[PDB]
Write a protein that binds this ligand. Structure first.
Ligand SMILES: CCCCc1nc2ccc(O)cc2c(=O)n1Cc1ccc(-c2ccccc2-c2nnn[nH]2)cc1
Ligand SMILES: [Zn+2]
Ligand SMILES: [Zn+2]
Length: 230
């Protein structure tokens, strides 16, 4: 069991640790109706790192003030998982609040071509940003749900922000695969299960959070759809 607090009505936080909370932001992502989105809020010493924002700026600006008022951290760092509304959907807000963003370089080149706000720090494989001594370990383990998708590993917290390459234990859906690397994903999770075999929490990019079975579960999903289309 773990605390489920509502900031708005359509915005929930769930605290998995002393320095890490996770929320789901339901918003309307155009073309699919009402989708529930995930994100990590990570607090070290009044400094707040945010791992993906909601669909627009309003909820970015909903979650960002709550994390002021109640956690008395200033959001100063951000990391989108890929370039989807569900990742940087609300980065327009946050660069304006001068937040410093880090992401996959691929995702940087991408957003640019589609003309979205652009993160300012890139990497090609791994990049360990410090929230004041708190390593916040981002990696590019390969493409999946999308080509630029990455994972963030909180080394002190054994918390793995799996992202949209992962699905919950509850869903058996490949969801939205327009910018995917299907033949390729299957082997990303494989790498991901190998690197954080010891992750206590492994949260997806949608769906409820879990353990490391979320990995073997998503893989299946993917093989069931590859094996069922190819
Ligand atoms: C109507 C669409 C399906 C809704 C849904 N609802 C859920 C409810 C509970 C839950 O635990 C999981 C889901 C879920 O995965 N989904 C699937 C879902 C699938 C894709 C999307 C979506 C929409 C726009 C851009 C990217 C995505 C995306 N799809 N997969 N990962 N990310 C959004 C939601
Ligand atoms: Zn996505
Ligand atoms: Zn997504």
């Amino acid at each position: 069991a773990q605390k489920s607090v509502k900031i708005s009505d359509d915005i929930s936080i769930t605290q998995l640790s002393d320095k890490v909370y996770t929320y789901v932001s339901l918003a309307e992502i155009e073309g699919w109706g009402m989708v529930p989105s995930n994100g990590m809020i990570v607090i070290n010493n009044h400094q707040a790192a945010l791992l993906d924002t909601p669909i627009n700026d309003a909820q970015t600006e909903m979650l960002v003030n709550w994390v002021t008022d109640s956690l008395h951290a200033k959001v100063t760092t951000f990391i989108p998982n890929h370039w989807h509304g569900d990742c940087i959907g609300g980065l327009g807000y946050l660069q304006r609040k001068g937040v410093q963003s880090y992401a996959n370089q691929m995702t940087i080149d991408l957003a640019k071509e589609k003309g979205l706000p652009v993160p300012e720090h890139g990497f090609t494989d791994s990049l360990t940003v410090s929230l004041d001594g708190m390593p916040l370990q981002c990696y590019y383990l390969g493409g999946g749900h999308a080509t630029d998708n990455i994972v963030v590993w909180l080394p002190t917290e054994n918390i793995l922000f799996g992202g949209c390459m992962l699905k919950d234990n509850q869903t058996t859906s490949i969801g939205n695969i327009s910018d995917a690397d299907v033949t390729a994903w299957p082997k990303t999770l494989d790498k991901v299960k190998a690197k954080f075999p010891s992750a206590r929490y492994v949260v997806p990019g949608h769906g409820n959070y879990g353990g490391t079975e979320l990995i073997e579960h998503t893989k299946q999903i993917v093989n069931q759809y590859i094996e069922s289309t190819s």
